[PDB]
Symmetry: D3
């Protein structure tokens, strides 16, 4: 029997035109796909979370696919992943998403090289969290560091977990701090 | 133009269940929001009529996105909301009753129910529950619902966040009787 | 009895101005809230009808307090709200549309406008903007307004917070035209 | 010209019947009266806040009178005072309320002996704050320590201040930790 | 043992100024917090005396950490606080008045002022302003101040967060007169 | 100088367990934060390079405090963060990627892993979860973790809060395999 039971999902698309500076030619879009699932381990200590982590890869694929379909496969430049575990769970129940969300997303995207950044928390329902993103091909590209806030008002309830993926289309709208540029990426190790 | 958009958000919330027997089709509630500069922040402007008039165009934009997102034949509930930044006043949000409501109803081919609403003057990041009801008859009990809106970094003190909401049906475990969609007979927008 | 009250709050908010010319009389918006045990928390109950029926009595209690507080002849706007604790479901709050609305309208001698509403399932301490409109005609534009409600330590997971709101008039700097109280002519509850 | 301009006021009355224990014969009522006023010093450093503090005594009297009229003069057993200053102000703009709110309230109440407890903060509009209360005749009466949350959704705006007084009618609903009792008060110094 | 510690936090806040002429030395306020299991969560326990007794050692632990952090000779203000998880009750935090206060006063060589306090029953992540006053005379007007405490993931429903606060001086721009440190003469803990 | 510090906070969070078998030694995560005036609040400044350069010394200050708090030989995870006040912009926080990261890495003798980060433009009191990872190899799965930061009264609209985080080890009940500290072999800062 599946360990994955979805109560609700949210898709958010934030389009930023400017931040009071000269507007860029095209706006930035950052998008998050979230799913609220029952936590099969809430309220007890389970030493073996490996089966759960394995099955969650399919959830990763589902959410990542939705994001590509939303933004367009050719438009992805930044990503992230995140988890919010309900108060009857533990951090480790969210930590399964590093592999499940990250690997699934990277596979959907043709295996870009940058590690997918992440943030997670154990929190009360409605908790809002800033999710950091970076460039999919080289984590050090300075223009692309950014953030989007995620959260669902009534989730995760104590015995639930909220899993999320984030994708975006470009650089900060007024990026102007130099550093490594897309054109300067030369190692192709996922960093520089 | 009195309308200068900094950012927009589109939210689609799909509910499969709420721990009861899952309905055949999930519910989708969607919100389309725009954060704009408040041209009147920091002073008392006696005439907000031109602003209210022009805002209808923002209503059209947002409503059009919602219909494109959910499908025109799939709309059953709606709402409108405004959050005014702390340097503004409530009246700056009140303009949206007409601007958002009339624009959305026009987009939808003039359904009869008044569009429900909520508004506040608040700090950036304020989150607000937005109530929805049935577009053809406000009293259809199965359809009363809510969705939370908000943007983390908005409205900043001299901004306004305007939003519209559309949805596809009843609460996932609606079971409290009352007037049903099918029983609607007066067509006055209530019953 | 399905109604076990832990605590109640009564809030009266008097607004003198919002940085414009102060009206002759300030506006008062008041909310009366009750936190009760949710008899259905933690399970799916198919029949919420008895609960909805009994809750009318809670509606009467709260509405009566509001009228006693503001004065019966001074009521111009109203609303109703519910916040369900995290172990409950939205349907547990939905019972209040009838229970709170009908009870309040009865207390007020059956004004014609549907009582507006908002609800959520939320954590203890959740705060919610509650929209109000004119009791005799929902379209009276001057009267659309809001008040925030909430109780710091409620609803706890197995509780429900039910609330009613009454107010004494228009927004303090209402100036957006629309249908006025005086122009009300249809008496259908809208116009 | 007056330094006191009120935008809005709130009166809250919280009645507690129980906290899942055996209910007391009469419920506890805790009430807060708040006023949101313009801050005449927002955005600058003013060395002399003494005139403002002096005039604010009248605001203290107004709010304290409202509370007695609400709860009944014969029913008061606990109190407190609090201030929330908008973000363009400073803590000192709230600190004026120790004297202005405290002394005014004590005078309205016939000069009970216990110092009025207090809390204050400089915060964003909508900030919610727990206000602690204690027994008006002897601060150490253990049964009476309690709290009520105050706040106004849209206040204080940056250039405003929210001032508040609190009064209440008795002990915690399930007080059971011994300590100094009302009957044991014998020094009458405001402590014991 | 009735004391099972999940996590602890120590926070030291240094204030150089608040947009006025900076004082000679900055103010430091420090909070030491401990999150523990609530042995009584979910039931009404009439006898909390053994718990209150045992908590004295937790008071001593937190107080000793604060003295070791700021330096015994530098302490001029203090406070105590408790946040109880939502499955508990207020009385579960009330035990800290004696356990925290007496332990801290003992550690500090019995200063005379009553330790001020604030408490709440709240959801995980609740943030609370904690008021401090002068350790030798509660009326010393320059010393009234506050610090915010809270832990993001605590107290969970079956936990309690207990905290102590110490600080090194007056508000950075204290200028409202009243009783001064130097004018203290009663030594009753008030004046 | 473009750096004017109003206040600083140091927080050390000690985790003994998270309801599982407690590890041999607890985890400590520490955050060092500084609230400064935003020299650019309210205007678009095209050249933020001098500010970014000058901020390096603030990075060194905060990093040195963290090493002195936890001990240089005990550091295994780090992060950096910024919260910009509402009158600023995101770019005002973005300067901290280099200023914070490079300063901290220098203090730590140049560990290879990129310092993770998160930033926001927000209202005073905004709380933010900050993610950490292993300082020698970002992929070490046991070490991914987070700590919440924030100051109640900061950043005010014309301020910025800059922060660094260091920690001493893995999650208290890390058990998901993946790359281990011991298996690190590339030394590129990833694996
Ligand atoms: Cl990854
Ligand atoms: Cl409408
Ligand atoms: Cl109704
Ligand atoms: Cl006093
Ligand atoms: Cl005591
Ligand atoms: Cl004490
Ligand atoms: Cl960098
Ligand atoms: Cl770095």
């Amino acid at each position: 029997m599946s360990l994955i039971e979805i109560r609700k999902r949210t898709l958010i698309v934030e389009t930023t035109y400017h931040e009071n500076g000269p507007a860029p030619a095209q706006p930035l879009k950052l998008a998050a796909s979230c799913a609220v699932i029952r936590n099969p381990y809430a309220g007890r200590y389970e030493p073996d979370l490996m089966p759960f982590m394995a099955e969650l890869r399919s959830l990763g694929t589902l959410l990542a696919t939705e994001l590509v379909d939303t933004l367009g496969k050719d438009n992805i430049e930044v990503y992230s992943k995140a988890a919010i575990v309900g108060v009857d769970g533990e951090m480790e129940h969210g930590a399964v998403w590093h592999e499940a969300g990250g690997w699934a997303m990277r596979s959907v995207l043709g295996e870009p090289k940058a590690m997918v950044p992440a943030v997670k928390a154990v929190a009360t329902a409605g908790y809002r969290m800033m999710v950091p993103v970076h460039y999919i091909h080289a984590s050090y590209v300075r223009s692309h560091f950014n953030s989007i806030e995620i959260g669902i008002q009534d989730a995760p309830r104590p015995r639930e977990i909220l899993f999320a993926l984030v994708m975006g289309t470009g650089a900060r709208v007024h990026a102007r701090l130099g550093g490594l540029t897309k054109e300067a990426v030369s190692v192709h190790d996922g960093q520089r």
